[PDB]
Every structure is written in C-alpha cells, then in structure tokens.
C-alpha cells in the first residue's frame, strides 16, 4: 500500500514510525520469515519518508541497545543481505542533517570494535578523533568486533561508490588517514581488517580515475594523487606483508602507473617526491619469491620505463642482470624485455651493480663456512658427467640437490635459490 | 661409464596385501650410505597418497593419474572405499625413500574383511599398530595426515604403537600434518592454540615431535614474532587445492598451495638423518635391516599380549 | 536453553503436553561455531543460541513448544572446545596424573553418555567427515556391559514414578532410534550414493560386532529398517562469517535436515512407535509418549543418581595401563635378577629401563631401587 504512491505527499509519517518500531523492538526470538518482512517493511518506510525523518528515527536506529545492531548476526544471508540493504537505505538520504548522526554512530561503533581489538593485544588506544559518547563503555569479543568492523566498512562502501555529501570526517581521508593504525600491528592478527579497509579505498578511488585530473569538487580533490602513491609506496616497502594484500597492491599500482602515461598533459606529474617513493616500492617489490608479483612489478616498472630518472633506471639494470638466470622461462623473457628498453648510455656506464654484489656476499659466506660433507658420490658424479659429456642424468633439479644437502638439526637467503648462477657456483664448490 | 643406477616410473610394493614380505625393491638400491627414509600415517581420507606424491616425484600442476602413489578415483569415493593398500616403497633421483602405507582403522578394510581370532576388528586394529611400530622403528620421520584438528584419538593411538615396538632407544621425528586447512585455520590465534594442545597431548611420548620443521620460519607469517609461541611443535598446513579491479580475484587468507606444498618438500629433504642401529648401513643393507624388522614384529611377543587384552 | 540441572529444579504453562525427547552428541572439530548449536538453530527455524556467545561436561537442554520436542546436547573433552580448556588448565596447573586425569574424563562422559541413553527417543551422532570412525564399536559394546549391570539401581531410582509399568522394567521410554549426520568437508546423485554406502557398512560392521540383534528389546539402540538414518550435510558460506562478509562486499563495489529429522519425530509424536525387527519372529516393542511433568519426575530422579562409582570403575586407558603394569612387572624380575653398589644399581636400572617401559615405570623404579638399596 505505501509503495503505491510516490514520495511526494505528506502522510502521516509519526503513525508509520510508531508502526514500524513497535514490531523491531520486539523481533529478537523470531521466525526467519518475520525478520525479513520487518526488515523490508523498514526499508519501505525510509524510502517512502525522504527528508522528512526526524534525527530520532536514525538515532535510535544506530545505538548499542538498538533491536538492528543484532540482526546482523543472524546464520541465513538473506537476514544478512535485508540488514545491509537498511543501512544502504538509510545511508541514501539527502538530508545533511540526519544523514551525519547516522554517519557518527556507524563510526563510533567502527571505533569502539577497532579499540577492543587493540587492547586484546595489550596495545593502547587510538581513533580518538572519531569516538562517539553512545559507545563510552562497551566490550566486543574478538570474533564480534572483526565482524562489526567489516560489515560497517561494506555499509561505508555505499556512500564511497556514489557518483555524486560533505561529511566532516570523508570517505578518502577516514580510509587513507584516520584508520592507518590497522596497517602498524593490526594487520599481522587481523589481516582481514587491512585487507577490507584497502579494498573500499581502491573501489572509491578506481571510479575517479585515482583523482588524476584534479591533481568546488576540483579545489577538494587537488591532493589526493599524492596520498595515493605515497601510501601504496610506503605500504610497498614493508617486507612482512600478506599474500593476499601485496597482489592488490600490484595490481592497484599496475593500474596507476599505465593510467600515468595515457596522456601527455601528466608530464610534469614525474617530478613529485611520492612518485619517488612508488618507484622505489615497485623496485623493492621485484627479486621476490612470488613469480606473479615480480612480474607484475617487471611490467609495471617496463610502463613506465621512459620519463624515469637515471638514478631508477641504473638500480633497474642490476635487476635485469640478475633476473636473467632464473629457473623459470617467464622471468627471463619478461625481464630480457624490460632490460632492452633502457638507454645504452646507462647499460654500458660504470656505476656499481648492487644486487650482484649481495651474490658474492652469499657465496662468500657460503665458502668461508666449514665443510659440511653432505655432497654423496653420485651428486658429484652427476655434476661431473654434464660438465664432461653435457648429460647431467636428471629430470629444476639444483635445486633439488641443494635442499637435498641441508641438514636441519645443524645460510644463503631463499629468494636467491631462484637464480641459476648461484646453484651453479655452489655446487662447483661442493 | 660413470652412468646413472637406473629411474622408477611407479612405485612397486614393498609388503603383500596379506601382510607378506615382498623382495622386489632391491634391484634399485645401491651400496651408497646416508640414505633418508619418510614414512606416513593417516585415516581413510587424508591424502597420504596425494601428498606422498607430490613430496616425492610430483607436482601439482599434474593430473592425478601420472602420481607415483595411485590416488583415491572419483567412483571410489562414492562406495566409501579405500584405495592405497599393504605398504609402498619409491626412491627418487635423490636417493630419498618414501614408503606409503594403507590408513589405520580403516572402515572399508574391516568391511571387506566381514564379507570373508575373536573378531575382525581386532585384526584390524592390531594390524594398524604392527605398521605404525615397523614405520617407527625403520624410518628416520613419520608423517601423520589428519582431515580435522585435534581426533583426540589419534594421539592415544600413537602414543601405544610406541609402547609396543620390537626393540639408547632409537625414536624417529613426528610431523603433524593438517590436511584441507581452511581460512580460519591460518590465524595467529588459532595457530598458537593449535600448538599449545598439541604440546599439552605429548608432553611424554618421548618421540622428536618438536625442535624442527618450524612454518614460521619459513615466512608463512611475515610478521609473527618468534616469542608468540610458547613452544612450537612440528607442524604444517596444507589448504584445499585450487579495468584492473573488476579483474581482482577472491580473498582466500592463506598462501597459495603450491607455494605450501613446494615449502614443505623443501623442508622434508633437509631432515636429519640419525643412525637406525649400532652400525652404520648401506642402500642394500636397510632393505635387509628392515625386513628382518617386519618378520620380528609379525611373530612379536608385545603385540600379542596386548591383542590378548581386548 | 539452560542447563540441565537448572531445569529439573524448577512449567505450569505446559506442563500436560506430549514432548518427544531428541538427544546429540559427537565429536566437534575447533571451530568458532559448534555444529551441534548449528542443528537446533536450523531445525526449530529461529536463532535458538546466539552467536558471538575439574570436570569438563556439560548437559543442555531446551523446549521448543511450536513442535513439543525436547532438545538435550551433550559436550565433554570429545569436542574441541573443552578439551582446549582442559589443555589449557593442565599447562599452567607426573607420567601418572596425567594418565589418571584423562582417565577421569573418559568416566565423566561415559557416564553422561550412559544417562542420556536412557531419557532420549532419537540420538543424533554428529562427525566432521564422511568417513565412519570404528571406535564407537567398541564404545558402545563397552556401555552395553555398564548399562546392564547398574539396571538393578536405576530401575530401583525410578521405581516410584507415574512413567508406567514397561518404563518402570525397561528404565527406559522405548528403544532409541540411532542416526547418523555426517560433514561433505569437501568431498565428493553421489551424494545419496554415499548415503546408501555408509548405511550399509555402518549396518554391517555393528551387526558382525553383536551389536545388533533381532530383537529390539536386549539392543542398546535400533536403526531403521526401510527409512534413511545417515544424512551428509553440504558446504556452504554460513560458516566463517567474515569470508561471507567479504564476499558480499566484494559483490557490492562491482530432503532436508527438518525433513529427515521430522520422519522420524512424526512416528513418536503419533504413538505408533518404532518397530525394527528381521529375526522372523519379531516381539512386541515397548513405547510410551509421556508430558513435561511426567517426563521431569523421571528425569530428576535419573540424574541424581550411590554404588555407581564402584561399578563404573571396573570398565580405553585400563587397557593401556594394565598392560603397562605388566610389563614392568615382567621386566622387574630380570632387574632384580641382576645385581661400590652405585656401578650394579646403574647397571639394573639400565637394563630394566632397555627391558619394558610404560606409563608405570616411576612405580616400578622405585620399588626396584628401594629394593636394591634394601639388600646392602
Ligand atoms: N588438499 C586437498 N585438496 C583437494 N583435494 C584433496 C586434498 N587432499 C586430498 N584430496 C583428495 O581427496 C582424496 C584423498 O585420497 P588419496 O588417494 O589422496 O589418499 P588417502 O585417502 O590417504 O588414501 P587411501 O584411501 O588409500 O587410504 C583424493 O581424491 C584427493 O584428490
Ligand atoms: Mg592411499
């Protein structure tokens, strides 16, 4: 009856409220069919009253005490599902007004979930900026707060994928600043947390093309490139970062560094300290265990080859040079590739190779080690036999051997047991 | 003339399906010394068979029909049956032993054996712990394979066969494999109560079950620190198998399993390597060693008296 | 959903009605959310138990009135989630306590499982695979033997109770009826298949070990004989709710358990009863359909059960343990037999030690060293 006519009309909106509140307050123990029929019913009622709701309605809606809160953590994703829609439906009004006291509660809530987390871990507290009075003494367990964390930050995504609300605290800056604490510790216990948060930021930002073009709604957005490339590159150099985590990263900073050089009017945007710092993640992110990741990195670095300073480019030519004995054919190829795009004059000059350099630290700390007589005759016949005659009688198998010469009960880094020169070099040794 | 022994293509039986001694292995053995030999355990379903193969001379990106240790078939799987059966041997390029047995307690053995001294389970029970004895006895590290965390009666059941071993007591190390790990597995919470059972269930079983074969060392979790864990255990996870940013794939929590698996063949190849007896022993001298082992064990005096009991 | 002991104390709004009593137990893997709440939560429709919510066992119970059936779940150290507690006790606070404190546990839930047993008319077995574990063969050959030899005082507990004349001899409602609910963990119509297979080896391995009969009276638990008692529950994203969250969200930035359960509650809540018998000369089977009240008065009595102790301490760790025992009995003569004193006492000890060990060798030691030093 009340999706009949269209929101255009002043119908009593005190009796519907009423209605609707009456039967939330009082669905606790109830069907699953219930549920959702509440559920929808409130959905109806807050998209039928536009801007016409009194900031009770929302403020009673969002409070620790309130009948919504825990809906959500019903078994079927139907409940689920009608649960998000009524934060979607409340967080769609335009009405400034109403919109912020549901703003706040849901980031007070956020804050309260994110600072029992931390002093599970006997850290101290933090998001003081965002804390909110109905949530002054509260305590979630541990599996209820990474819950509420998550499903707030999803409700958040309604708002941040909007294709046009002057908030104070905004989607971008809450993500890229007010939440940085989950990357310090946070992510190492709850990877999930920094995995949402990462997530809602790159989804909010691929939809203005990364505010590239900025870089009333232009004068807000005419810093935000440079907090992007200054996050992922410092969020890059961390060497205790998740698998999950590092591929988005790779794929986030693919995607800036192509967009980079789709047009020639972002020319002078090659001079800035963050796109430093995004260069020199890329290069840390190379020489990595993952072969996916190095070459996702190799074609990004290869993007962006040109309008490179020198400095870059010389620490690229050490990578290639030590990419180019690599176990496996993609490797090689696509790092042949990235090495054939540099300028002679920086291939052939005579600075230092620092990464050829940490090889013969390792073999040298391999040689000055005492002899640990694990080499059997056959090893050696076998390396014997494929340098007199070129059969080496086995069907990657340096690998093979190296392991199979270590002994656990009794020191070269792992990500160089990728590289042939170094296989080679030690076993010649041994 | 410096040629290779010669190459295995599939692994041969190393013990009859009658529980019967089969000298077909040593026209691969050597007089090289050093050997290394890995030994499994497990129930029906783990995947002692898959996991056997894809340490040994395997790799993921195979099909199930070239592994060395012949896999559970799709329409096996329907009758609730079992497929690796007696005890299996294979020795790779590296002159590495893998011995692969059939799964303890087996429901479908039993069964088979219904359709054919006091009643089948004994036998099947027993049976169980003469192989899990002769595997402690001959091997240098015993594998368990487990589907779910924490049987409760797995640990009984090893800390028995122990007990009753033929004969400075020589113990092997243990390794705890979790098989199909999920998501909520590979958090640093669970992960330390998973270690602290595991240590609180064998705090005197007197077998090497810890002090090697560390995951967090081997970058599993980047950013653990060592002091989290009270005392780590040998264990391991293995998961199930297998513009830009409607292209992202699903979050899954772990790491990749081929990278798992590739980690835990790399670690298995650097165990150490002990001596079985007062004598230092050969290829050829362990294939004798052990059987003289097996026939002990068949005709033992413990197991009997223990069968005697139930 | 209280505690079974804080309910038998305390109804008048339901006091007269027919409840059928459904009983679970099982073992339980180390997860956030235990399958057996899980089950009650999807059987009755509403969110029954909610989520984010010495001795080691514990009894529950709860009355759903839209269906007049009585839940009962069962935890003991089988689940992971006491027997965590339990590790975690023992880490902060000998060979031999440690074996006697497990020992003590595995009474604990064999007499919970015995009681349960007996105040039940479907028991549900819940396992984290398909595959049937053979242990419970000889768990419940190991309850038979206890339960019919501590008849005498339980039927005497009972004896001045309206339950009526077949209970009062059988001490028992009528012949429970077993099912099975197994998890797919990935596994694998195939699944009716398995269903059929499990059936019939789990129908086949409990009759060849006696226990199954043909006559339903003497059996510890009947099966069904034309319907289905084994249900394989399939995966699903209802678990792990953050992996369902992330799903969602990724989304956002671009028969039945109730049925099998009900064709066998139906046959209860109809007074028919059960009746499974293939020997060809079938017996007539006791049953009897009692209210809240009535269930309750026996029930109390039930739980509140003197000599039980003493006849539950003859019935696994005994086996271990004797045979511990005797082989450090068998090694001690040789030690004896074998020995200025330190050089023969090092000597015997050696030799006992490479001898026999178990979980009873501190005893034995020290019998053999107090009996060394004695003789000098
Ligand atoms: N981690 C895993 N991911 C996916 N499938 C798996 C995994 N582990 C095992 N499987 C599958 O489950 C089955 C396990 O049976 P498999 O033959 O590997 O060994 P098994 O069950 O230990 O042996 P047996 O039945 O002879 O005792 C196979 O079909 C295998 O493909
Ligand atoms: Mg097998």
Redesign the pocket.
């Known amino acids: 009856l009340l999706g009949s006519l269209d929101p255009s009309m002043t119908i009593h909106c005190d009796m519907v409220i009423t209605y609707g509140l009456d039967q939330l307050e009082n669905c606790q123990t109830c069907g699953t069919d219930y549920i959702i029929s509440v559920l929808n019913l409130l959905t109806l009622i807050v998209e039928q009253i536009n801007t016409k709701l009194p900031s009770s309605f929302v403020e009673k809606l969002f409070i620790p005490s309130s009948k919504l809160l825990f809906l959500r953590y019903h078994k079927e994703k139907e409940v689920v599902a009608v649960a998000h829609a009524v934060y979607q439906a409340v967080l769609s009004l335009k009405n400034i007004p109403v919109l912020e006291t549901a703003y706040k509660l849901i980031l007070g809530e956020m804050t309260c979930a994110l600072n029992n987390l931390l002093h599970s871990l006997q850290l101290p507290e933090a998001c003081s900026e965002i804390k909110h009075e109905a949530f002054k003494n509260h305590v979630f367990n541990v599996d209820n707060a990474k819950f509420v964390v998550i499903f707030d930050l999803s409700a958040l995504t309604t708002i941040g994928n909007a294709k046009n609300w002057a908030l104070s605290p905004t989607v971008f800056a809450l993500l890229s600043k007010n939440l940085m604490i989950v990357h310090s510790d946070l992510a190492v216990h709850f990877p999930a947390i920094q995995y949402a948060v990462l997530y809602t930021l790159y989804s909010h930002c691929t939809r203005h093309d990364h505010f590239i073009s900025s870089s009333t709604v232009t004068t807000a957005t005419k810093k935000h490139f440079s907090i992007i490339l200054n996050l992922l590159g410092i969020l890059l150099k961390k060497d205790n970062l998740n698998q999950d985590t590092r591929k988005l990263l790779m794929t986030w900073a693919l995607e800036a560094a192509v967009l980079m050089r789709k047009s020639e009017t972002y020319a002078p945007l090659f001079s800035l300290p963050s796109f430093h710092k995004f260069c020199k993640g890329l290069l840390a992110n190379t020489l990595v265990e993952d072969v996916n990741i190095c070459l996702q990195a190799c074609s990004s670095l290869h993007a962006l080859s040109s309008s490179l300073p020198d400095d870059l480019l010389q620490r690229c030519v050490d990578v290639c040079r030590v990419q180019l004995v690599h176990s496996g054919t993609r490797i090689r190829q696509a790092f042949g590739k990235l090495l054939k795009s540099i300028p002679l004059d920086v291939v052939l000059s005579n600075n230092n190779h620092t990464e050829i350099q940490e090889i013969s630290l390792a073999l040298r700390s391999h040689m000055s080690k005492a002899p640990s007589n694990t080499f059997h005759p056959q090893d050696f016949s076998d390396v014997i036999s494929f340098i007199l005659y070129g059969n080496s009688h086995r069907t990657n198998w340096l690998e093979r051997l190296f392991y199979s010469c270590q002994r656990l009960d009794k020191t070269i880094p792992r990500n160089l047991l990728k590289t042939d020169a170094v296989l080679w070099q030690w076993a010649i040794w041994e | 003339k410096l040629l290779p022994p010669e190459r295995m293509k599939h692994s041969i039986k190393l013990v009859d399906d009658q529980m019967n001694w089969c000298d077909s292995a040593i026209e691969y053995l050597l007089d090289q010394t050093d050997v290394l030999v890995v030994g499994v355990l497990?129930?029906?379903?783990?995947?002692?068979?898959?996991?056997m193969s894809l340490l040994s001379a395997n790799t993921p990106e195979e099909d199930?029909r070239t592994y060395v240790?012949?896999?559970?078939?799709?329409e096996?799987?329907e009758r609730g049956?079992?497929?690796?059966?007696g005890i299996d041997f294979f020795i790779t390029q590296e002159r590495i032993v893998f011995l692969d047995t059939?799964?303890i307690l087996?429901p479908?053995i039993l069964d088979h054996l219904i359709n054919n001294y006091n009643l089948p389970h004994t036998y099947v029970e027993m049976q169980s712990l003469q192989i899990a004895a002769f595997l402690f006895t001959v091997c240098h590290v015993v594998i368990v394979?487990q589907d779910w965390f924490t049987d409760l009666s797995l640990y009984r059941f090893l800390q028995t066969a122990e007990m009753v071993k033929p004969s400075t007591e020589y113990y092997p190390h243990l390794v705890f494999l979790q098989?199909?790990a999920r998501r909520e597995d590979f958090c640093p919470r669970k992960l330390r109560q998973m270690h602290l059972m595991i240590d609180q269930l064998m705090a005197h079983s007197h077998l090497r079950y810890k002090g090697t074969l560390s995951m967090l060392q081997c970058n599993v979790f980047p950013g653990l620190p060592p002091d989290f864990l009270d005392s780590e255990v040998n264990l391991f996870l293995?998961?199930?198998?297998d513009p830009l940013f409607s292209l992202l794939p699903g979050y899954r929590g772990h790491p990749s399993?081929q990278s798992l698996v590739s980690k835990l063949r790399s670690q298995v190849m650097s165990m150490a390597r002990p001596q079985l007896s007062h004598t230092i022993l050969t290829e050829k001298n362990w294939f004798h060693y052990a059987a003289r082992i097996w026939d002990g064990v068949r005709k033992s005096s413990a197991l009997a008296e223990y069968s005697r009991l139930l | 959903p209280v505690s079974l002991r804080d309910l038998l104390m305390g109804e008048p709004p339901w006091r007269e009605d027919e409840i059928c009593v459904v009983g679970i137990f099982g073992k339980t893997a180390l997860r956030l959310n235990s399958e057996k709440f899980s089950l009650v939560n999807t059987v009755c429709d509403r969110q029954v138990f909610p989520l984010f919510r010495q001795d080691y066992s514990l009894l529950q119970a709860y009355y759903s009135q839209e269906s007049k059936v009585l839940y009962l779940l069962l935890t003991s150290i089988c689940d992971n989630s006491q027997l965590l507690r339990a590790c975690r006790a023992l880490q902060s606070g000998p060979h031999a306590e440690a074996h006697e404190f497990w020992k003590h546990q595995e009474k604990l839930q064999c007499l919970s499982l015995l009681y349960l047993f007996s105040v039940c008319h479907i028991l549900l077995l819940v396992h984290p695979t398909c595959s049937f574990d053979i242990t419970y063969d000889r768990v419940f050959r190991a309850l038979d033997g206890l339960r019919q030899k501590v008849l005498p005082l339980l039927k005497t507990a009972i004896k001045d109770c309206p339950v009526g004349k077949d209970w009062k001899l059988n001490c028992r409602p009528c012949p429970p009826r077993l099912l099975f609910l197994f998890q797919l963990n990935?596994?694998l119509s195939p699944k009716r298949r398995l269903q059929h297979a499990l059936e019939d080896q789990i129908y086949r391995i409990f009759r060849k070990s006696r226990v199954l009969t043909n006559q339903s009276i003497n059996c510890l638990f009947t099966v069904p004989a034309n319907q289905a008692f084994v249900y394989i529950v399939p995966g699903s994203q209802e678990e792990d709710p953050v992996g369902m969250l992330l799903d969602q969200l990724r989304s956002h930035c671009t028969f039945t358990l109730r049925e099998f359960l009900w064709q066998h509650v139906e046959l209860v809540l109809s007074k028919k009863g059960f009746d499974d018998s293939v020997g060809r000369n079938p017996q007539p089977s006791h049953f009897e359909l009692p209210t809240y009240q009535k269930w309750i008065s026996a029930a109390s009595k039930l739980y509140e059960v003197s000599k039980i102790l003493s006849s539950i301490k003859v019935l696994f760790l005994d086996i271990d343990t004797k045979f511990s025992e005797n082989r450090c009995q068998k090694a001690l003569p040789m030690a004896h037999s074998a020995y200025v004193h330190k050089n023969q006492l090092a000597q015997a000890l050696r030799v006992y030690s490479q001898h026999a060990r178990g979980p009873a060798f501190h005893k034995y030691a020290m019998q053999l060293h107090e009996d060394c030093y004695k003789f000098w």
């Open positions: 497990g129930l029906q379903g783990t995947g002692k068979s898959m996991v199930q240790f012949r896999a559970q078939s799709a096996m799987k049956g079992n497929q690796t059966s059939q799964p087996s479908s394979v098989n199909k293995v998961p199930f198998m399993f | 990935g596994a």
